[PDB]
Structure formats: C-alpha cells, structure tokens
Ligand binder design. Structure first.
Ligand SMILES: CCOc1cncc(-c2ccc(C(=O)NC3(c4csc(NS(=O)(=O)C5CC5)n4)CC3)nc2)n1
Ligand SMILES: CCOc1cncc(-c2ccc(C(=O)NC3(c4csc(NS(=O)(=O)C5CC5)n4)CC3)nc2)n1
Ligand SMILES: NC(=O)CC[C@H](N)C(=O)O
Ligand SMILES: NC(=O)CC[C@H](N)C(=O)O
Ligand SMILES: NC(=O)CC[C@H](N)C(=O)O
Ligand SMILES: NC(=O)CC[C@H](N)C(=O)O
Ligand SMILES: [Mg+2]
Ligand SMILES: [Mg+2]
Ligand SMILES: [Mg+2]
Ligand SMILES: [Mg+2]
Lengths: 483, 483, 483, 483
C-alpha cells in the first residue's frame, strides 16, 4: 500500500485532521481508494471514558467504537465507515504487546520499545490499511496516517521510531511524510516567523523522518521571504513549502492544496495512476445571506457539522446559539427558529416544554427523547436497525419512505414498554419491539425525538434527515419538502 | 523516606546492581534499614517467561514472584526478602494506568506519560519503599532504586522524568542520584577515556537529574588526570568522582566505596544518623589455596553464588566446571568431586547414574530429583513448607535438626504418590503428604535430590545447606561436620 | 554582582529586550544600579556593516560602537550610556580566543568551546558588568544579560553552556534566569496553546538552566487553565508564570511586571536591599487626542522613538507617515505638518525643496544636512563636541542656551570649508572650525539640518531638542516655547 | 569529486586516522588519486603552539604548516605531500568568516553558523579536494575527510551540519560516511557491548547523516550475535558492519578492510572505475626475530615510525627505549645499540658525550646537532634545500650520492658562521652558505647531526636515510650497505 504520514509541529490545533482529510478527498477525487488511520499517543483505550471538554465529542463508529472526533472528519470528507482499530492508541498497542508476552509469543525474549512496540505499530498499520473501509471489498491504495500530538512529545516517540523504520521496511515510492507546522504572525509588525517550523523540522529530522511537504498554517498567506527562509533552513524546495491560511470554511482547504499543487507532488513521489463539490460548497458558504437561528441546549462537533450540512443544503447560514441548559438563555430561546436538545449523560426540560407549548421546531437526540417523553408525561452502542411503526411519520418521509433505518446508538437507558400504553406517538422501535427509539408529536410542525445519534451519519453530500427536517421546519419549507 | 537512585551510562553490564547492593550493605552496616527497588524498563510482566540466556536466571521470591537476578543481589547483600512489587517494570506500570483508565479513575481526562505514568512510578516507589522487607515491622529509612538500562534508552525515559519530578516533590536531603559509567581503557596506549562518561552525564543532565556521585568502572584504577577531566567536564567535585576497578570479588566492592568515602558523602547529603565481614570474606577469597571441582551439569547465578558461599565457608576455591548435559564433558565429570544437576524445563541422567554407581557426591535440584527418581527406577511457586519424614537424614542434620524447612519452589511436576510404594528414600514431603520433595540415597556419602531451589535462600553469612553438604562431601568433611 | 539572564523561546520578536529593559528600570526605581549586556549570537563584529532592514537600525554609542537597536532600548529605559563591549557577539569572543591562542596564552593546550569559549563569555560578563555605565563611578549591583536568539539555535549553545556553569561558579542568590516564550492563540477557537513554552523550557532545562520566571507573551491575557498547564508541565509555581499581553505602549510593560509581582520575586530570590513616570506616560499615551502628522522621508527606530517622546511631551499623538524617497507620497507630503529627512548612505531633495518653498517645518539629519546645503545651492563616529557660532539660533534655545552640545556622529562626508563663503546660515561647527555641523535657514519657522544623530540621546524624560523643535513648529507652539 | 567522511563515536583514540588512511591506500591501490583533509574542531590555528603531550607531535608540512600527527598518517600511507589548508580547524574557518564580514563580503546580512560557517566548510572542502597533492597535476578523484572528535561534541556540530547539507548539495554517488565506534568488551564475561555504537549512530542520525559503514573497533573480533544487534539497532545491513580488532601492526588494517569487502561496497556506492606491500610488511613484522635496541633520549611519533620503517627494511624488531634526558636511564643507555637525540625547544649532552667517547651510533636531530656541536666544543620552517660540502660523507651515500637534499626544517637557532673556523666536520649547509645544517664526526662508525627533521619524509617504501644509517650502524651493516 502507499502510506502518507501526517505529523504535527508546534501546536496540535493547527488542523492536521483537516489537512489529512483534505489530501484524502483529493486522492479520492483522483479515483484512489483511501484508508485512514489515526494515531492518538494517549494511553486511553477508546474515548468512551472521555469528557466532551477534553478531546471534543465522542464520535461513535458502526462497530460500537467510541473515538475522538478526527475519525468523524475522515468519515465526513472521504465517505468511509471506519472500524475501531483504525484508531491506534498507545494503550491498545502496549496492552497488545503485554498480552502477547503473557501468551509466551515473544519466545522468552525481553520485550522493549524498539523492536516490539515499533513492530506492533507497523503490523497494525499494515493490516488495518488493507481493510475495506469503503463499501467496496476492493482493497485500498493509499492509507493516510495522522500522527496526533506534536513531534517532540514523549508519548509520540514510539510511533515516529516505527515510521522511521517503515520508510526503510517499505520503499520511498510507498511512503511520504507531511509536516504541518504553525507560522506565528506578530501583532506589532505583521512579521511571520519561521523559527518554530525550523526547530520542529529539526526535531522530526533528528527522529529519522523528513518533511516531504511542509504545510505552514498561518493567519495571513505567507510572504515569499518567509517561504525562502523555510525552504533554506528546513532543506526542502519552494514547491514543498505549502501555505494554508485562515479561510471561510473547511470546504476551501482541499482547494488550497490543489492550488499549491499537491497532486503533482504525490503523482511524482508516490507513483500514482492519476473536486468541483468542494469549490461549489465553499462558494455557496461565502454567498449565504439568509439566517436560521437554532438553539443548541467541539463538545457537539458532529451536531454542528450536521446542522451546517443541512443549512448549506437550503442556502441558509446557521446562527448556532449554544445555551447551557442550567440557565439571556431565554432571550436566545425566544429567537430560536428551532430547539436542538442533544445527548449527554434536567434543565433541558425548560426548552422542551417551551418548544411543545409555543410550537417552535424541536429535535431531541438520545436524552432529548427520554426527557421529551418525561415532559409529555408531565450499552446499546454502534449501528442498530430501527423499524418504523407506520408510513405516516415525518422522519420516514425525510429518510425516503424506507421501512427501517440503520443509525448509530449510544445509550444505556430506554423507554419502559409497560408505560407506553399510558400514551406524542412512538413512531420507531427496535426489531425486538421492546424499545421505542423514535417519537413524533403530531400537533406540531416538527417535534421529533430519536434515541440514536444521526449526526455521525451526516456528510455534506447527504445531510442527516432529522437535522434537515429541523432546518426545513425552522424555515417553513418542511411543508414544501414533503410535497 | 530517603531515596538513592542509581542510573547507568554507556553499557548495562558495569555492575550497577553490585554498586546499589554495596551502598545498601554500607548503610545497613551504619544501622539503617534499607529497602531496594529495581526498575527494569522491559515491558515483560515478571521474568517467568524469560530464557535464562536473555537476562540471566529467573530468581524466585517468597510470594512466587519470578524476577531477574539483581533482586537476588539485593537479597544476598542486604539479607532482605523482597516482594514482587519491589520489581517495577514498564509492563506493570502501563497495565496499571490502562486498568485505572478502564475503571474511570482518571475522571474522563486524557491519559498520557507525563503526568500519569510518571505519577504511577512515584506512587509505586513511595509505597513499596515503606514496605518492611527486613523481618522488622519497623518501616525502612532508605530505598535504593536501581534504574536498569542505560540513560538514553527510550524505554527508560518515563522513569528519569518521574525521578526528575521526585527530586522536587521531595527534598534534596531525601533524594540523591548515583551515575555509574564506563571509563574505557585503550590497549594501544593504556589511555583511559572520559568522553563516554561526559556524554552520558550530559544526557542525564538533559533529563533534569545530575550525578551526586559519578562511579567510574574501569579495568585499572583511574589516574588523577582522568579524574580531573571528569570533575571538570561533568561539573562535580573530585570527591564525587569514585573509581571502582576490577578486583578479586564482589566482597571487595563495598570496601572500595568506604575507601572512596561514600558514607561521608551520604552523611552530609542525606542527613543520616550515622563492615568487617566484607573485608574478612574478601581477604579469605584472595587467600584460598585448596580446590573443590564441582561439575555443574549467569543462567545458574544463584547456584554458583551458593557454591561459592559454601566453598568460602570451608576455605576452598571453587573450580566450577559447567557441562552441557547433551555431551571432554566426561573428562570434567571424572575430576568431579561432586555432581550438581540443577533445574531447567534428559542427558543429565548420564551424570546421575555415574554419581550413583561411582559414589561421587550428588545434589539434584528440581528436575535433578525427578530424574534421580527416574534413574533409580531404571505452578508450585514461591515459599512452601517441606516437612521431614525422619530425623535420620543428612539434610535434617545440615539444616540444624529442624522438623521442617521453608524453601522456594518453582515446579509444575511432582512424584506420583501411587508409585512411591515401588521404592532411595523419600525423606521430605509437602504438609499434604502427597508430593515427595526431598530424596536421599543411603548407600552413598551424599546423594540428595530436592524439589525446591535452596539457592535463593543462600547468603554469605549462612550458606545453603544442600549446597554446603555437597562441598563437605566432595572434601570428605561431611563425616566430620555431622560429628 | 547579581545577574539576570533573559533567554528567548519560540521566536525572537516577542519583546525580550523590552522585558529586560523593563526589569532593569523596575530595579532602577528600587534604587539599584543596573548594568546591561546584550549577547548577539551573530558572528558579525559590530553592526557597522548591517543593513537597517536586517536587524533594524544601527544604534551608535558614545565610544563609536555601532550596535543593534536593543542597546538603545537599554539606554532609553535605564538612562545609561553603554560601551561597545556591553555588546557581546560570537565574532568578538571567537576572535579573542583565537588571538589569545596566537599569543601563546593557552600554554600549548588545545583550545575548544568548553572550556575556553565558555570562560571567555564568563570573563567578559564578569568584567563589563563591573563597568560604571551610569555617570556614577560607583560599581553596579545588577547586570541584566539579554541572550538574543531563541534557545535551541546552534549559535546560542556556547552562551547557555557558559551560563549553566556561571550558576555554579556564582551562587543562586546572584543568578536568576527569565525565559520569555510565545503562547500562540488560535483564531478558530480563542484557545491559547502552551506546547511551545513546554518544549522550549524542556530545551533550556536540557541545557542545564531552568526558568526562574516564565514570561508568556500573548495577544490576549492568558486564562488560568493555560497558566495551570504551564506551571505543571514547565515545573514552576503559578507566581513564576507571568503574562504580558498586547498593550498600548512599552510604557505599560514595566507596570504589568509590578502587577505580576516581579519585585517580590527578585527581593526573595536575589536577596536585594529593596515607578510613577511609567504609569503617567502610559496613561498619557492612551489619552492622546490631538494629532501631529510628520513625513519621514525598525530601520528608523530611534528616530520614531524620539518623535514619540517629543509628541508625548506636547500631548499629541504622532501620525508618522513613512515615505520612500524615490516616490500618494506627495499626498502624504501635503498633509505633512513637518518633514523629517533622516540619514542613510537623492530623491529626498524633492521634500527639502518642498519644505523650503512652502515653509513646512524641516529636520534634516546627517545626509539631510548635506542635501539641504546642496538644495539651497540649487569615519567621524561616536560622541563629538559641536560648538555654536552664535546664540541667535533656534537649536541653541532648544538645548537650553549652552554654547556647545555633545552628540553622536556617524558620517564620512562633511561640508567643504572653501565653499561656505558662497553662502541658509551655518550655525554649529566642530571645535577645529573646519566642518559645519548644524545649519539653520532663517526665513522659515523651523528648517534645521544637523550632521549628528540626536535620536540616540533621546529618552522619555528628556526629548531630543531637534526632534522636539520639529513637533513644536508643526503645532505652531515653537513661538510659544522660545518665549 | 567523490567524498568519504569518517566520523567518530564513543572515544577519539579508536584509530579513525588509521581507518581513513587505510581506505585511502586501498583506493590508491585501485588506481584512484586520493586527497585527504582533516577536520580538527579545535580553535587553534595551526599546531605550532601545541605541546607534544596534548595532541601528540607537531608534524611539519613542506609549506611550513605545523599540524597534528594525523596528516603524517595520510602522508605515510598514501605517499602524498599535503598543504596547510588540508588541515581545517574551527579557528581557521571562524577567522575566515569574521574577516569576510569585516571586508563587507556578506553584504550587510547577519553572519550565523548556518549558513555562513557551514558554507565556509563546504567551500574549503570542495576547493582543497581539487588541489593536486600527489606530484601529478591531474586533479584528485576521492577526498577522504576525517572529522576529528566524537560526534556529540559541541565543537563538531558546525561540521556535521555542513556535511548533512553536502550530501544534498552533491549526490549519493559522490558522498559516503564511515562511522568508527568502540565496541567495549567486559573483563568479567567477555561480553561485547553494542550500546555505545547504537547511541552514537542515533546521535549521527539525529544530525542528519547516517552510517554507510559502521566500523567496530574492538579488542577481540566481534561475534555474530553482536553484529546482528548492531545491524538491527543501527539500521544497516550485516555487510555494512565491519570489525577491526587488535592486530600486530597498522600494516594489517588495510588487509582487514579488504577481507571485510570495503572495495565492493565503495565500487557499488561511489560508482568507482575499479595491496601486496601491506600484506608483505604485515607478514614481515610478525616474523621479526632479531632486535635492535635504540635509546630515544606519541610526542615522537614520526621518529618512532621512521625507526620502524628502517628496522623492517633490515628485518629487525625495534626495541625503542625512551629515556627522559634529565635522568635505569644509563642502564638503557648501556644496552643502546644507537642513541637517538631528537628535537625539542640540556641533560641530552650526557648521551652525546657517551655516544662520542664509547663509539656507540648517534643520530642528533635539530637540537641534537646544536648540542653535539656544543659537546664537541667542550622560524626556518618547512622544506628547504641543504647542499652537501663534499661527496665523502655517510649521509650523501645514504641519500644516493645526490649533491643536495630537500628536507623539512623547524628551527629558530643555527650554528654561528664565525665560530665554525674553531673546528667534527660540517658536511651540509644552506644554499646561502651561512648555516651549517649537517655535521658528521669522522672518528666514529655513525655520529651525524642534522638541523632538519627527516622523519616527516619517512614512508614504509622509502625509509628516512639518517634513521636507516643509525640502524645499519647499530647492526654493523652500514659498512656493508655503503659497499
Ligand atoms: C487546516 C485547516 O485550516 C483552516 C483554515 N481556515 C479555516 C478552517 C476551518 C476549520 C473548521 C471549520 C468548521 O468546522 N466549519 C464548519 C463545517 C461545516 S461541514 C465541516 N466539515 S465536515 O463536515 O467534516 C466536511 C466538509 C469537510 N465543517 C461550519 C462547522 N471551518 C473552517 N481551517
Ligand atoms: C514585551 C513587549 O510587550 C509588548 C506588548 N504590547 C505592546 C508592546 C509594544 C512594543 C513596542 C512599542 C513601541 O515601540 N512604541 C513606541 C515608543 C515610544 S517610547 C518607546 N520606547 S523607548 O523610547 O525605548 C522607552 C519608553 C520605553 N516606544 C511608539 C514607538 N509599543 C508597544 N510590547
Ligand atoms: N447518548 C446519550 O445522549 C446518553 C443518554 C442517556 N444518558 C443514556 O445512557 O441513555
Ligand atoms: N524448576 C525446575 O527445575 C523445573 C523442573 C520441572 N520442569 C517442573 O516443572 O517441575
Ligand atoms: N549617517 C548618515 O546619515 C550618513 C550620511 C553620509 N552617507 C555620510 O557618510 O556622511
Ligand atoms: N625543532 C627543534 O628541535 C628545535 C631546536 C631549537 N629549539 C631551535 O629552535 O632551533
Ligand atoms: Mg492540549
Ligand atoms: Mg543487552
Ligand atoms: Mg529572524
Ligand atoms: Mg582527549
């Protein structure tokens, strides 16, 4: 397989996942099947224990893997459905090697980082790259590997040592390395400074990799004097120093990479047999004039992404108003064209009662369904089939008249079957008939609650129907859309 | 507690365990209760899976812990009985942190090397230092920590980062660091070279520790010009550059440290409220003239140590003749004053039949008992009580007429109770009466087989009685000793 | 002496010279005599060969030393007059050691970086610290050492190794180290990132120094979560993590350091026997409402500084309009309340003829005098005495009626004595009577040309009289000031 | 040109100069013209100020360059005559860059290590490689560059950064790097340890070079297990891990490199168009049985080398007896078959009077001529012509009847012309006729004194005639040789 490593310098928040997902959809537009793997140097096995404040939201995969949001970036850009072992962590690898040792698999030899941990990294990366992650059983051609962290962090040292070796245990034709680095710009002078990138490239080069591309992220476009310094002190040609500045949307980030000629570079380097939508969506986004104000009652990234897909599909700008549910909160809730009550693991019941009584559009997700059932009366993890109990339901029209949907669940509580006879219609259930998994309130333009998280299914080309329904309702257009 | 870290430079085989055990028995001679901990940066949990070729023999603790031989050095020097958690490994610590993560104990925070692994190291080192490892319930005063590896190995980086912090999270009065480094000597010139030590001290200093002592190990004593270079370039006073050269025995290594004044240094530095035997045993060893040639039919370190304790106790030099049992082997076996058949997990039966028929003294250990029972006819891990079935047995006289002994076992097979009635006397058994655990053959000066490993119980001050019995028999003196 | 090292991390432009000059005037306000030294790791001996585009302007000292502008920051803040050896460069030190070697002074020993270059650094820093740099012959108490560059640059490695040693070859009471580091703030999130500071502190700690203060420079004030990360990962208490954000003026930067409590820290640490103006000037600067627009026809730093001193002294804001003299340039020159033609080594004659014919206030400096003499008709380095040829001159009134002034020259051409009889009055000359060094044109509110650079004499408390005269004339107030 | 860099690891004394000179004479035997350059990271310009105790003897070049002894190794192996700029030092390069700065040659730009010092290294290495250093005006094909020091020393960092760049600013076909590293062997076990080499290769790889060959120097030949560890952890094939053990003579070191196949490696790598004497001389040296005991009254390396060339040419082993001239010294001087009084800058007169009165063979060099003239009565640097005053002189027969010789001088005193008329024959003089430069005493088998140092002219294939004459006289064979 062809491998593209993406390493970070200076600071992690520079958008490496957006770079990695961008070069993935570029190569996908060039007809190549692209896998992705994320390395997270954290010792946590899965993100199921994380707070959404730490590493952003917990993204859920079809197999029930709970991971950080950058796997959702890979899904949303590439239109792939990842498996849990496309997340590599230090915890997963050290536990593997430890469990191999206790089986005797290392044949009485001393286990140590080089070779055994570095070989575990290589074995994992070789094998999960070969796994069909598009719906085609046809084995992938490229695997993009985001090495999370910044090079120089001690946690990341096993992985760069593995990738150093993986150059030599492959071929140059089959392995390239992107370094994404910050070029800070001083407020006093406008002077863009190269010294972080120079020092970070020196560290990466000290660890036996080298930049095949340097990707400057910067506030303003980098001047030629700054690119000359980088190409000199980082020992890479001008064509190999790429600038991504602040732009309107993530839709524009692939387009900058075309304009900086990465496909010529990867064609030459990786010996490859080689957008429209990305320009169209970027150009749309810059030309949005109508506003939809949704009350949301990186902690809710896929939620926001799904709304913005939906918003762009109806040529509205989203004015997303985040509201802490313990609560100007009610002022925001007055100019709410829709209420979105997302998931979590009580004060949300304010907004649900408001939405119900004032007939303001409502989407409840997970907890929002449970609370809506409770309000009206006053782990199941990964992909499951939810069957519709009628065809007279708004979500069934939105999903295209299909008798069931398959969506990603993450919940440990459910509605009691014995109490549903006290009743708001329960419109979707599990195949067992026990759990109700979708509610719709009929005396309302759009008040639906779903047990599942349809966010994780959202992609720009196909907005999440429960989130689309909300934005259609919030602009009156639902009555048109179903007609 | 007071802590003494011992770090290695250049190469691991320089005797750091002998330095650490030496400064331990020095401080014990000064009346201080000394704990020891060994850090092994290997990812192996326990040494139970190791080949005796890799890391030397597998030493067995009373609690059933299977560890590398350097814990046996701590036991043999200090006369302490260690617990399995006095061995720290990367595997034990990473598995701890991983299992804490899966319990939720890190409260939805991202686990990473600093802090979480470094804190696990500190927590472990604080708590196992406080554990009474002498028979006194009186909590220890000093803990010697051998950091295995060489500083600069990637495996060791979590530990030095932990110890960097442990300086600051303690007091200077409570933490010192020994650096043991090679001073290589060129064959062409006799020139002793300081550059390895300078470079290794620079690495240690780059990792936020510093030498409080530099211990040069060297072939010849270091000249003053060499010590001046080290004290300049390593930024430490002349009194803090100690030389241990090649000497006769490990018995002399504490004595060099007295003569290089470490007790004055530790009194001043560690604010401490402060040998004979070590000189006596060293002086004896240099004056040994009689030879005992034992056929042994670092893989057998505690075995060799136990023989040399026994040999010194009868003022003989041991000419230990190692013989691969698949086999000049029979030439060695002809000048064998005793056969020692140690443990392992078939060709040994040559030497046992030889020993039986020619009346040459025999000690069989573990496998050697099983094979001796088999020859005459032609896991249970850690401390167990073995009871004697008579008082007319040579081992019972050797052990001082006691009705039982408590010795360290490591075996998964045993003699069949149903077949013992076919019978060589079975002299010791388990308390259950099922397993026979000691045999003696009566028509022989000394042919005993034991299931246990009495090596691990050997200390210079009290030689292992089965090994002593062998050397007494091999010199005729057994008939005198029992009389 | 007490020493304060100031090291940089991430990027050089963060204002380390302003930090170093700030802590200097703080300690001066506490009654201490403060020396300053700047280390520039460049191999250039002097700045006399530099372009003003590279390292900013060439600042000129009284002794004829041509240095970078940060020595001018030390003069302007502290009111000291530095000597050329208060600039240390790699070139000056390597040439010293080389010339010592060629004299035989190293006694046939091999010269190498440690010790000989590192000792040369220490010898220089010890001795130039002791030099009275205030007008008091009373030896200094503190020496602030700005280590230019960023720690991690190869050029700077001799100096940090010297300062590592200088800790130990002094006392902790006599040596502290400030680390100034960038905390970058992401545009997408507002998230302030600590990873550069953590990595730069790790480098500094790897080189055997440590931060006694960490000074974050940042766009916004740092949040407490960001300071907690820094105090944890950089192993320094919260009180030792100082935040300097973007503020109105350099006048406010000492005031932030008071408010972050550096005097308590230095009192405790350095065992010291311990502003108004800085607050007053900061508060004035923020309250400026009147504008003076001067046409200037970091390349002209002391010029801009001298104007802003003058502007603040008449409570006007300076709208400094820089104009490339080869040239909207004439649009700027129309709204010029004064023309300033600075020095350099032809198109400037446009602005001088304009200024002369339209009676718009003019200051010509060096080249501007020479060009003004030429227009009307159509090295001498460091402090020299210029004598006035009358008392009926505007500059003599401005300088306080004194018959001569002593100002800093830097010119290789001068007016021909034989041609002055063709004449615009020549008002000041050298003591030799040969060179005319000041001109005034009488038929004009203010058209003066001076050979010297009176910028380098400017300090906030005493604005440069030729620059003050310009701003008084540009606001009509000159007629009042002389009256 | 093709370039071969030779870097050191662990310790400098491992024989890198002998490796570099060996691969030079290998490639010379393959018909290639080989230049050599030595980098000495010392700041000393020339070795003229060195003590012979520090860096060994001061070797003198034809151009009057005074250098360390490793340039003499290049001359003695390759039969080249080096120029002073074939020695590169930090002092020579920093002074070059400094002097360029003061000429304005860097065009007002800031001088710093990268690029300017690194470019100076490259410029020097490119240009002195092209200089004909054989007597052929035909430009060289290979330049061997010994990088002195050990990689990891701060002094050497400019040079490895230069060579990192010089890979890329050349081609792989034109640049290879040898790493010479110590494999220490423990006395206790015979275990050969790879960890120094692994750590030193990691440092070299961190500095952006990599071993193309790893040359282990070792006491015993390295076992295959040790070479497997090195080829794994240093990431180089088995064929690229070469072992040079302790051997009889330097003559055998090329032969080991043939037997380890370096010519196949350099043919493949460097794309080259490709001994006897070295085997013959090695085999002779091992078979020497007759002894010649010379009293010498690395400080005298070329002297010892010249004696051993001479000794091998008459199939005697040299028993060189070094005697401190202030002085068992006279016991050595009794069994002296010849006295050698070398140069230096008084007690030597004991041995000269002894040699004269007892008719024991004498060679006086420089000071030894001056002292011999003084005893009988009781800078001029580099190549000069010395003319013979007769053909009835022993040195003229030894040098092959030639009327003059050209030999390397290094003296500041000479014999007074006015006093020679008081006279021992003065046999050779300068062309000016002023200085007497050779004496011979007639009433003696061999008592000659020379002003020059004929050591520096010695090569195995052509022994230095004054040193040959001594050893012939000391074995009676002079009377045969002249006949
Ligand atoms: C190297 C990165 O450099 C830069 C430079 N400048 C700006 C940004 C930037 C970063 C994040 C965002 C963002 O999150 N925007 C939103 C959105 C809608 S759709 C989607 N992404 S998506 O569904 O995964 C699929 C389409 C790809 N994002 C509205 C929420 N917008 C801009 N990134
Ligand atoms: C750690 C630095 O952090 C920050 C944070 N925020 C802002 C700044 C900042 C940097 C430079 C400037 C500046 O140059 N301002 C001017 C001026 C007038 S007088 C003088 N300096 S001076 O004469 O040497 C003597 C008084 C000290 N400067 C107008 C030209 N103003 C603000 N620096
Ligand atoms: N995913 C969620 O929103 C969780 C909802 C609720 N706490 C449950 O466990 O069902
Ligand atoms: N410790 C040993 O010598 C092992 C003996 C034998 N293999 C057993 O398991 O009993
Ligand atoms: N300092 C300057 O402005 C230089 C002016 C002019 N070039 C001279 O040398 O006199
Ligand atoms: N080269 C030497 O032996 C020096 C001899 C003597 N000191 C001189 O200067 O002539
Ligand atoms: Mg973070
Ligand atoms: Mg080993
Ligand atoms: Mg710069
Ligand atoms: Mg040396």
């Amino acid at each position: 397989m062809k491998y593209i490593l993406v390493t970070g310098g200076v600071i992690s928040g520079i958008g490496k996942g957006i770079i990695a997902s961008s070069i993935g959809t570029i190569l996908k537009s060039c007809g190549l099947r692209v896998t992705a793997i994320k390395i997270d140097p954290y010792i946590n096995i899965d993100a199921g224990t994380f707070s959404p404040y730490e590493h952003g939201e917990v993204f859920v995969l079809n197999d029930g893997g709970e991971v950080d949001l950058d796997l959702g970036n890979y899904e949303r850009f590439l239109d792939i459905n990842l498996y849990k072992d496309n997340n590599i962590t230090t915890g997963k690898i050290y536990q593997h090697v430890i469990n191999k040792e206790r089986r005797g698999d290392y044949l009485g030899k001393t286990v140590q980082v080089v070779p055994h941990i570095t070989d575990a990294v290589q074995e994992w990366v070789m094998n999960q790259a070969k796994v069909p992650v598009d719906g085609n059983k046809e084995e992938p051609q490229i695997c993009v590997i985001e090495l999370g962290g910044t090079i120089g962090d001690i946690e990341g040292m096993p992985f760069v040592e593995a990738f150093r070796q993986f150059q030599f245990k492959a071929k140059r034709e089959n392995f390239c390395n992107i370094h994404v680095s910050l070029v800070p710009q001083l407020s006093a002078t406008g002077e863009q400074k190269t010294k972080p990138t120079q020092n970070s490239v020196r560290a990466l080069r000290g660890l036996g990799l080298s930049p095949d591309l340097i990707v400057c992220r910067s506030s303003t476009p980098i001047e030629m004097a700054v690119k000359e310094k980088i190409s000199m002190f980082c020992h890479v040609n001008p064509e190999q120093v790429i600038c991504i500045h602040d732009v309107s949307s993530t839709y524009r980030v692939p387009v900058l990479l075309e304009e900086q000629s990465i496909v010529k570079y990867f064609k030459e380097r990786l010996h490859l047999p080689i957008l429209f939508k990305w320009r169209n969506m970027a150009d749309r986004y810059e030309r949005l004039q109508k506003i939809c104000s949704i009350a949301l009652v990186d902690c809710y990234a896929s939620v926001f992404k799904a709304l913005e897909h939906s918003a762009l599909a109806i040529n509205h700008k989203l004015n997303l108003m985040y509201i802490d549910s313990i609560d100007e909160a009610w002022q925001k809730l007055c100019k709410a064209d829709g209420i979105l009550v997302p998931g979590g693991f009580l004060g949300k019941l304010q907004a649900i009662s408001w939405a119900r009584t004032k007939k303001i559009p409502f989407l409840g997700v997970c907890l929002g369904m449970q609370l809506a059932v409770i309000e009206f009366a006053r782990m199941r993890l990964g992909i499951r089939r939810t069957v519709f109990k009628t065809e007279n339901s708004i979500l069934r029209k939105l999903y295209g008249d299909v008798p069931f949907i398959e969506e990603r669940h993450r919940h440990r509580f459910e509605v009691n079957p014995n109490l549903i006879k006290q009743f708001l219609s329960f419109v979707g259930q599990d195949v067992d008939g026990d759990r109700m998994e979708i509610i719709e309130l009929a005396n309302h333009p759009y008040f639906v609650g779903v047990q599942f998280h349809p966010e994780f299914s959202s992609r720009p080309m196909k907005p999440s129907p429960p989130y689309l329904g909300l934005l259609l309702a919030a602009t009156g257009n639902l009555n048109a859309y179903l007609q």
